[PDB]
Amino acid sequence: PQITLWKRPLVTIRIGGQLKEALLDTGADDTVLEEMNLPGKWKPKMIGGIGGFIKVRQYDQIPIEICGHKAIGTVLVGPTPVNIIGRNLLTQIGCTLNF
Amino acid sequence: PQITLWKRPLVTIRIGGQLKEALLDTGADDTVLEEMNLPGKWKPKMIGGIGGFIKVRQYDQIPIEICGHKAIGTVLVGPTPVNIIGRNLLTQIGCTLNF
Numbered sequence: 001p002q003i004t005l006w007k008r009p010l011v012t013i014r015i016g017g018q019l020k021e022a023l024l025d026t027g028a029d030d031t032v033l034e035e036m037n038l039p040g041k042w043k044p045k046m047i048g049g050i051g052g053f054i055k056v057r058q059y060d061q062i063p064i065e066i067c068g069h070k071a072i073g074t075v076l077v078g079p080t081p082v083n084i085i086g087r088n089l090l091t092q093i094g095c096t097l098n099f
Numbered sequence: 100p101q102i103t104l105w106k107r108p109l110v111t112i113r114i115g116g117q118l119k120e121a122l123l124d125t126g127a128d129d130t131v132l133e134e135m136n137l138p139g140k141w142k143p144k145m146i147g148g149i150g151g152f153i154k155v156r157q158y159d160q161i162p163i164e165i166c167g168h169k170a171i172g173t174v175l176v177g178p179t180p181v182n183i184i185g186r187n188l189l190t191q192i193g194c195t196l197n198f
């Protein structure tokens with residue numbers, strides 16, 4: 001697919017039994033999802049952007065389906081205002097910038 | 100160009116005759132540059148990111164050449180962690196996401 005940027009590049013993602021709308025975000029190194037109580041081990045982390053830092057929980061090797069494409073990797077879970085698909089998973093679904 | 104996402108999509112920009120490195124950021128609605136001097140009238144604005152809200156200075160109709168492509172639009176100056184080119188200018192240079 002090709003996604004123009006007139007509007008936010010929101011797409012439907014699936015993580016287990018939850019479907020969410022998430023930004024395809026080339027400006028994010030890592031994937032950050034809204035608060036959710038995922039199973040398994042995790043580690044605490046601080047992540048920073050505009051406005052400062054929030055505390056997240058890092059879960060590894062989490063399968064996520066993005067627009068019907070399979071990905072699996074690290075997801076950061078915390079009080080983000082928007083779900084964010086970062087470069088760690090964008091590469092896995094074959095995503096590039098073109099102009 | 101086609102830009103893959105295994106590395107940060109940093110490009111050279113030219114603004115007011117100065118060369119800077121900026122991140123192509125599809126998750127950003129706006130273009131935000133670190134503290135710098137720009138000529139002309141500006142107005143105070145507030146924007147919200149992952150960590151909360153910040154105050155920025157809004158400059159309108161500023162030319163930036165982004166990786167050899169011309170844009171003229173709104174540039175916000177303030178405490179961003181990194182210079183980011185947002186959708187307001189990404190659309191001007193014909194940037195799309197593809198996978």
Ligand SMILES: C/C(=C\C(=O)N[C@@H](Cc1ccccc1)[C@H](O)CN(Cc1cccs1)S(=O)(=O)c1cc(F)c(F)cc1F)C(F)(F)F
Binds near residue numbers: 050
């Ligand atoms: C405020 C703006 C952009 C912005 O913050 N963009 C981030 C995505 C976002 C949008 C709206 C609300 C919250 C977050 C960036 O595209 C991604 N950021 C990175 C930024 C780069 C430049 C500024 S913020 S990040 O802070 O969210 C971020 C930080 C991490 F440490 C991380 F691991 C993952 C992330 F997504 C705007 F450009 F002014 F609109």
